[PDB]
Design a protein around this ligand. Sequence first.
Ligand code: A1A50
Length: 167
Amino acid sequence: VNSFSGYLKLTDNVYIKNADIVEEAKKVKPTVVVNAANVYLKHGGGVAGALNKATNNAMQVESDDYIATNGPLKVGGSCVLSGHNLAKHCLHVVGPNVNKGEDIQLLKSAYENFNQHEVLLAPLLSAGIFGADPIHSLRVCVDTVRTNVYLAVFDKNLYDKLVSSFL
Ligand SMILES: CNc1ccc(NS(=O)(=O)c2cc3cccc(C)c3s2)cn1
């Protein structure tokens, strides 16, 4: 039993809610919140910008130190950093950005990072301003992640579209 509430059950381990992932993190304070990052951990917009703004830019400061030490992530890769005021940890996961011309087959590799954590709050990777089809992202999620994932979808109309088309 965990403190996630109001989520619609999609499968054995995947649950979904029409919610702001930032507001859900502040309420639940989960062990792991997933950020939809880029390889440089530049959290300017989208989920990343929203999470980072909610940390008062502390996420960006920590991320810049991480990159200065380790260099960029791989597309499909991840790193664990602090969750600041939002969660114990933030798992920064790089899904392919179709608008940048990156390989969509890397979406499965990106979701595999979730399997290293028992319970996560997460967005649909590569969706939104990353340019992939969210119906596809949800399918890859359900077919790849085996741990317990609580998906937050900001767009009300997309949430309804995702539920009603889910096989
Ligand atoms: C197509 N139009 C549209 C509008 C709103 C949303 N919302 S969302 O699924 O929470 C969401 C936003 C976002 C922003 C950056 C990166 C990611 C991975 C995500 S994922 C989705 N799609």
